[PDB]
Amino acid sequence: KEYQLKGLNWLANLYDQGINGILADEMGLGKTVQSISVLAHLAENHNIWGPFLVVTPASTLHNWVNEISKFLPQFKILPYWGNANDRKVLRKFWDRKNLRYNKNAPFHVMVTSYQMVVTDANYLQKMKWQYMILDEAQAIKSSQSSRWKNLLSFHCRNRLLLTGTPIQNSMQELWALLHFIMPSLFDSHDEFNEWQQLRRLHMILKPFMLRRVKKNVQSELGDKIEIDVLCDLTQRQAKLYQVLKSQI
Amino acid sequence: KTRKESYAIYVYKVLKQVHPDTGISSKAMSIMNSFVNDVFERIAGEASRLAHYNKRSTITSREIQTAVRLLLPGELAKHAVSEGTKAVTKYTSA
Amino acid sequence: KTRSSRAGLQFPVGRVHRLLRKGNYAERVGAGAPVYLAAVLEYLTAEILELAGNAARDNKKTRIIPRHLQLAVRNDEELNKLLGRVTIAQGGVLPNIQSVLLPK
Amino acid sequence: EKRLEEEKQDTINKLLKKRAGKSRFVKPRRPYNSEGMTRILRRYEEDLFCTF
DNA sequence: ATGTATATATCTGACACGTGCCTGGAGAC
DNA sequence: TCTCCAGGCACGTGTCAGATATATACAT
């Protein structure tokens, strides 16, 4: 019930254009309810209740489950956490063998973590997905990660990403996310590095990201001020520096 | 369920009594379970035949004493008859 | 009040007495014979548990694999004669290479 | 009828496991202790001296 | 340019303890 | 052979070992 409905309409427009998008906005405006509104809008558009994967850290896994429970309880929610007995029980629970769209299905909402994706590389290589949403994407900043290679090997071709700040390291991570958006276009980092520096960098990523700042609504959130307190060391904390520098 | 008979806990905590900081696996429990009923039927048979050779109709400490003095090659019998006699004297003491 | 505690022994004495009654060995069984059975059984497993323990700290492992009891049972001639004819599942071969078979 | 009952029991157990895996003051005073100990009470209207 | 060193931080993963129970070992004749 | 009760068997929950990851300055 905000501007983010029109933002997800723009997301549906770029979904119609066929290019996966990156949301580079800071957390605090409720991207989870907008993501499930995207889910409900696509289910109203092309009638899909089936494969929907949510990649989410273990701190926010139950938060995502609670949000999708209280906000949109129409779908069926299935979690993925626990022991090996629960692992094979849930492996029985999503046996499927029926692609495209199903209505009376138990895999409507599927939430999982990065470590349980990573430890099931031989298991998750099957059951090719139609939609993955990855939340808190600061852990895939490097292309040397095994989780990054495991998420590269999937057979879904849909890479919508949720993060708070994707600008952690603007040397390799931008090429990595552009490669995850379209693996066909970007495969070599040398052509990205070789192809005035500050002005020309903004126009590269212009049509993908959206431009939203936190200071556009009624600022009743608190207007968080920063107070830095600077103190002096104690004599117990003084000679320990010379102790640690003595042996060097 | 079924009431399975096994002396795995007995061997487990004599292991714990003599080696307080040593672990063990379930295949080991099965493997010396096979050991102890192997020797249990072997020496239960031995004494049986022997006593029947002696034409005695029972099994007291005497038949099994000569059976364990006769059967195994050495050393373990030399400690075994002494510790078994000490065991039956603490029984008759009690 | 248990008879094993009265005998001062740890291996059970009522269990072996039960197995001796219906084990069809003798029609009459004395009182001291199951105690003697439990005593020699406790001595045998005490001896090879010492052997498995020193094999375990020789290989520096907290868990006694059956291979530990293979090189514990092949390091003494008394159990090399008592358990020489036996066949052990997952036992391997002890290290033994002839001097003539070695080159040079 | 046995297969349908087994399937229903397995479905109920799986649903219970999924539900369990998805959705599932004032400090006490010091113990006052006094045995074999003479007692003096002091109230608004009377006093007591319980001796031994 | 790259290994690395040594502590994180998550985060599973295999293993030992606290309640029921029933039945067979012990006391007595 | 009559009696009877607790010893051992069965089934749960916490608690220390491996595995990926950050990370940045120093040395080769």
UniProtKB/Swiss-Prot annotation, chain A:
Annotated positions binding ATP: D25, E26, M27, G28, L29, G30, K31, T32
Intracellular or extracellular location(s): Nucleus
Every Helicase ATP-binding domain range: 12-184
Function in brief: ATPase component of the INO80 complex which remodels chromatin by shifting nucleosomes and is involved in DNA repair. Its ability to induce transcription of some phosphate-responsive genes is modulated by inositol polyphosphates. The INO80 complex is involved in DNA repair by associating with 'Ser-129' phosphorylated H2A histones as a response to DNA damage.
Note: Present with 1110 molecules/cell in log phase SD medium.
Subunit structure: Component of the chromatin-remodeling INO80 complex, at least composed of ARP4, ARP5, ARP8, RVB1, RVB2, TAF14, NHP10, IES1, IES3, IES4, IES6, ACT1, IES2, IES5 and INO80.
Free-text comment about domains: The DBINO region is involved in binding to DNA.
Family indicated by similarity: Belongs to the SNF2/RAD54 helicase family.
Protein name, UniProt field: Chromatin-remodeling ATPase INO80
Naturally occurring in which organism (per UniProt): Saccharomyces cerevisiae (strain ATCC 204508 / S288c)
Name of the gene encoding the protein in the UniProt record: INO80
Span covered, complete protein: 707 to 971 of 1489
Curated annotation (Swiss-Prot), chain B:
One GO cellular component, as annotated: nucleus
GO molecular function: DNA binding; protein heterodimerization activity; structural constituent of chromatin
Chief localization: nucleus
PTM entry text: Monoubiquitination of Lys-90 by BRE1 gives a specific tag for epigenetic transcriptional activation and is also prerequisite for histone H3 'Lys-4' and 'Lys-79' methylation.
Localization terms from the record: Nucleus; Chromosome
Positions glycosylated per UniProt: S82
Described purpose of this protein according to its UniProt entry: Core component of nucleosome. Nucleosomes wrap and compact DNA into chromatin, limiting DNA accessibility to the cellular machineries which require DNA as a template. Histones thereby play a central role in transcription regulation, DNA repair, DNA replication and chromosomal stability. DNA accessibility is regulated via a complex set of post-translational modifications of histones, also called histone code, and nucleosome remodeling.
Record protein name field: Histone H2B 1.1
UniProtKB/Swiss-Prot annotation, chain D:
Record's compositionally biased regions (Basic residues): 15-24
Top-level taxon of the source organism: Eukaryota
Sequence segments annotated as region (Disordered): 1-38
Intrachain S-S bonds: none
Localization (cell): Nucleus
Role played: Component of the INO80 complex which remodels chromatin by shifting nucleosomes and is involved in DNA repair.
Quaternary state and interactors: Component of the chromatin-remodeling INO80 complex, at least composed of ARP4, ARP5, ARP8, RVB1, RVB2, TAF14, NHP10, IES1, IES3, IES4, IES6, ACT1, IES2, IES5 and INO80.
Miscellaneous remark of the record: Present with 1470 molecules/cell in log phase SD medium.
Family membership: Belongs to the IES2 family.
Protein name as catalogued: Ino eighty subunit 2
Originating organism: Saccharomyces cerevisiae (strain ATCC 204508 / S288c) (Baker's yeast)
Covered range of the whole protein: 254 to 320 of 320
